[PDB]
Design an enzyme around this catalytic site. Structure first.
Site, PDB file in Angstrom:
ATOM      1  N   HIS A  55      -4.031  -8.208  -3.764  1.00  0.00           N
ATOM      2  CA  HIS A  55      -4.035  -7.200  -2.705  1.00  0.00           C
ATOM      3  C   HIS A  55      -4.425  -7.800  -1.359  1.00  0.00           C
ATOM      4  CE1 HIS A  55      -4.280  -3.408  -0.633  1.00  0.00           C
ATOM      5  NE2 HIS A  55      -5.516  -3.691  -0.261  1.00  0.00           N
ATOM      6  N   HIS A 111      -2.537  -4.883   2.243  1.00  0.00           N
ATOM      7  CA  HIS A 111      -3.865  -4.598   2.791  1.00  0.00           C
ATOM      8  C   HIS A 111      -3.904  -4.378   4.299  1.00  0.00           C
ATOM      9  CE1 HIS A 111      -8.094  -4.166   2.921  1.00  0.00           C
ATOM     10  NE2 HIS A 111      -8.380  -5.375   3.370  1.00  0.00           N
ATOM     11  N   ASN A 125      -8.480  -2.761  -2.535  1.00  0.00           N
ATOM     12  CA  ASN A 125      -9.861  -2.524  -2.124  1.00  0.00           C
ATOM     13  C   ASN A 125     -10.237  -1.044  -2.158  1.00  0.00           C
ATOM     14  OD1 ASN A 125      -7.998  -2.469   0.204  1.00  0.00           O
ATOM     15  ND2 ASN A 125      -9.835  -2.069   1.439  1.00  0.00           N
ATOM     16  N   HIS A 126      -9.254  -0.141  -2.166  1.00  0.00           N
ATOM     17  CA  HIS A 126      -9.503   1.290  -2.296  1.00  0.00           C
ATOM     18  C   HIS A 126      -9.566   1.768  -3.745  1.00  0.00           C
ATOM     19  CE1 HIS A 126      -9.199   2.683   1.965  1.00  0.00           C
ATOM     20  NE2 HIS A 126      -8.661   1.483   2.085  1.00  0.00           N
ATOM     21  N   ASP A 186       0.824  -1.197   0.000  1.00  0.00           N
ATOM     22  CA  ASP A 186       0.000   0.000   0.000  1.00  0.00           C
ATOM     23  C   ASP A 186       0.863   1.254   0.000  1.00  0.00           C
ATOM     24  OD1 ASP A 186      -1.687  -2.123   0.478  1.00  0.00           O
ATOM     25  OD2 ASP A 186      -2.985  -0.989   1.848  1.00  0.00           O
ATOM     26  N   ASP A 224      -4.069  -0.184  -3.486  1.00  0.00           N
ATOM     27  CA  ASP A 224      -4.276   0.867  -2.486  1.00  0.00           C
ATOM     28  C   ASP A 224      -3.327   2.052  -2.716  1.00  0.00           C
ATOM     29  OD1 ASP A 224      -6.312  -0.596  -1.477  1.00  0.00           O
ATOM     30  OD2 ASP A 224      -5.499  -0.806   0.565  1.00  0.00           O
ATOM     31  N   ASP A 267      -6.383   7.437  -1.183  1.00  0.00           N
ATOM     32  CA  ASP A 267      -7.064   7.517   0.114  1.00  0.00           C
ATOM     33  C   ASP A 267      -6.094   7.678   1.283  1.00  0.00           C
ATOM     34  OD1 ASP A 267      -9.701   7.457  -0.797  1.00  0.00           O
ATOM     35  OD2 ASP A 267      -9.883   5.281  -0.561  1.00  0.00           O
ATOM     36  N   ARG A 268      -6.582   8.285   2.369  1.00  0.00           N
ATOM     37  CA  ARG A 268      -5.877   8.415   3.645  1.00  0.00           C
ATOM     38  C   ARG A 268      -4.705   9.388   3.570  1.00  0.00           C
ATOM     39  NH1 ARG A 268      -7.569   3.029   5.296  1.00  0.00           N
ATOM     40  NH2 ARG A 268      -9.671   3.444   6.120  1.00  0.00           N
ATOM     41  N   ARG A 292     -13.787  -6.749   9.531  1.00  0.00           N
ATOM     42  CA  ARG A 292     -14.143  -5.606   8.696  1.00  0.00           C
ATOM     43  C   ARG A 292     -15.612  -5.595   8.292  1.00  0.00           C
ATOM     44  NH1 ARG A 292      -9.418  -3.263   6.134  1.00  0.00           N
ATOM     45  NH2 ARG A 292      -7.557  -4.555   6.515  1.00  0.00           N
ATOM     46  N   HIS A 302      -1.209   4.565  -0.372  1.00  0.00           N
ATOM     47  CA  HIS A 302      -2.226   5.419   0.243  1.00  0.00           C
ATOM     48  C   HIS A 302      -1.876   6.899   0.106  1.00  0.00           C
ATOM     49  CE1 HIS A 302      -5.181   2.649   1.738  1.00  0.00           C
ATOM     50  NE2 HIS A 302      -4.283   1.929   2.386  1.00  0.00           N
TER      51      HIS A 302
END
Lengths: 300, 206
Positions: free
Chosen positions: A166, A241, A117-118, A57, A85, A88-89, A214, A59
């Site tokens: 991922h 992940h 997943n993002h 990731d 990923d 995001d974040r 989750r 991010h």
């Protein structure tokens, strides 16, 4: 145009972290459209050969991505596979994905991006990517990114020995043909194989398959990994992940490794980042990106 | 040149992970492939440190027998004896002391010895503290006062004694008031002061 885009993205290498690169709306749309062509032209289940550097990731932590290339070698000195990923974040999702898409277009046979997943409209709407597009550009550009992400490949197998995706395994995953038959573009469903590949997690305490904290997909135990590897004549599963303190973390003895390449994840953790190098002999070693945290006695 | 159409781990990676979890045979395999069993990673972590923190007595004995540096200090200045003391692991302390641990070695921070790192909040403290306390008191007394040098030393003053690694030195006067961190010793007829932290009760494994 590509060389100008890459050059401007790399201009901040010597800058204080946080400085933005503001491409034009048309430039970014170009990156999405051209790379999308490539993703669809290549297999959904990639078959890659060493040497290769595999990263987890990011991010949107663009300046950590730049350090990652700095220490690992900027393309094309090294070949890269990312495990998803990208947005995001972090505060600089746009610069991150653009540089990765740009290198994907420039070096399409030596640079590879898997879907996390993002890379899903319903997730990155929520955790910051949409917010960044709306602030710096517009909503239509975010929808353009969604069109691109929907065509990303889902998994890769390196020299028939390292299975990469991922998230992790699936109780529905019985034959590799099940992955190859997935048609693109596609969204990530609420359940099923494609969902599980991007969302499931290993768990030391589960025997077989368990429920995921989750609220999505499953957890899988060490016996699941062992059964999977022997069935498909594989040696190692490489996935991402989950944040791991050392940047990599082994599971099921050494049959699975989790990679995470964003140090000090959104300023809330003190983890280091790592990438895994695989040479032509398939020897795996790790490189760490870590943030900043005998004498003779005297005489009388 | 494009990339689109058995796997191993680095031996150092196998060694550090196997020493922490307890796969002896894997450690034995890694040790044969790599050149130095005392090889540290980018974080200063060595095989022996992970074995001590993991309480893997079997792996500790093997690595010591294989010649792992029982005195290599980590980034924090902690030697293998310091980690064993912080875990109240008497068995490891014995293995280290009996195979060349520097009893009077001190950490880089606050300069404390292994005895002072015993954790009175964990079980096994009394057993571990008593051993370390007696070992400190026994050097220059036990084995007729003979101690083994763990490093080369070139005398810094005329009243000091020079010695090479592995040589046996006899401690004559311990509690000398004029020097609390040095001992009056004898080596091949020559007498002079020697630093406490350069000797172990037994020699290294070479």
């Amino acid at each position: 145009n590509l060389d100008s885009i890459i050059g401007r993205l790399l201009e901040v290498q010597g800058s204080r972290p946080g400085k933005n690169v503001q491409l034009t709306e048309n430039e970014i749309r170009g990156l999405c459209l051209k790379s999308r062509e490539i993703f669809l032209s290549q297999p959904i289940l990639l078959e890659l050969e060493a040497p290769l550097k595999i990263c987890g990731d990011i991010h949107g932590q663009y300046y950590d991505l730049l350090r990652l290339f700095e220490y690992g070698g900027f393309p094309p000195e090294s070949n890269y596979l990312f495990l998803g990923d990208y947005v995001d974040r972090g505060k600089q999702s746009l610069e991150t994905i653009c540089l990765l898409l740009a290198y994907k277009i420039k070096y399409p046979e030596n640079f590879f991006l898997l879907r996390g997943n993002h890379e899903c409209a319903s997730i990155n709407r929520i955790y910051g990517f949409y917010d960044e597009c709306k602030r710096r550009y517009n909503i239509k550009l975010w929808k353009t990114f969604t069109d691109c992400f929907n065509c990303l490949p889902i998994a890769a197998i390196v020299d028939e020995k390292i299975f990469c995706c991922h998230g992790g395994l699936s109780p529905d995953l019985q034959s590799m043909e099940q992955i190859r038959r997935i048609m693109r573009p596609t969204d990530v469903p609420d359940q099923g194989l494609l969902c599980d590949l991007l969302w499931s997690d290993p768990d030391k305490d589960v025997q077989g398959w368990g429920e995921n904290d989750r609220g999505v997909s499953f957890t899988f135990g060490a016996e699941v990994v062992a059964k999977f590897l022997h069935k498909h004549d594989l040696d190692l599963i490489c996935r991402a992940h989950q944040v791991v303190e050392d940047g990599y973390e082994f599971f099921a003895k050494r049959q699975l490794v989790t990679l995470f390449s964003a140090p000090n994840y959104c300023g809330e953790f003190d983890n280091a980042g790592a990438m895994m190098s695989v040479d032509e002999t398939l020897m795996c070693s790790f490189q760490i990106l870590k943030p900043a945290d005998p004498i003779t006695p005297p005489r009388n | 040149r494009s990339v689109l159409r058995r796997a191993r781990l680095n031996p150092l990676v196998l060694l550090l992970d196997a020493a922490l979890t307890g796969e002896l045979e894997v450690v034995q395999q890694a040790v044969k492939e790599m050149n130095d069993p005392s090889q540290p990673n980018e974080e200063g972590i060595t095989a022996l440190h992970n074995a001590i923190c993991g309480a893997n007595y079997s792996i500790v004995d093997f690595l010591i027998t294989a010649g792992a540096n029982v005195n290599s200090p980590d980034s924090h200045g902690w030697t293998p004896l310091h980690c064993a003391a912080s875990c109240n692991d008497t068995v490891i302390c014995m293995a280290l002391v009996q195979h060349g641990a520097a009893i009077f070695a001190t950490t880089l921070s606050d300069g404390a010895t292994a005895f002072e790192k015993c954790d009175p909040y964990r079980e096994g403290y009394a057993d571990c503290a008593t051993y370390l306390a007696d070992v400190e008191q026994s050097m220059g007394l036990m084995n007729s006062g003979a101690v083994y040098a763990l490093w080369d030393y070139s005398a810094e003053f005329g009243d000091e004694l020079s010695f090479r690694e592995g040589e046996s030195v006899t401690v004559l006067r311990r509690d000398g008031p004029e020097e609390t961190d040095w001992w009056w010793a004898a080596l091949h007829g020559q007498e002079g002061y020697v630093p406490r932290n350069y000797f172990g009760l037994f020699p290294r494994v070479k």
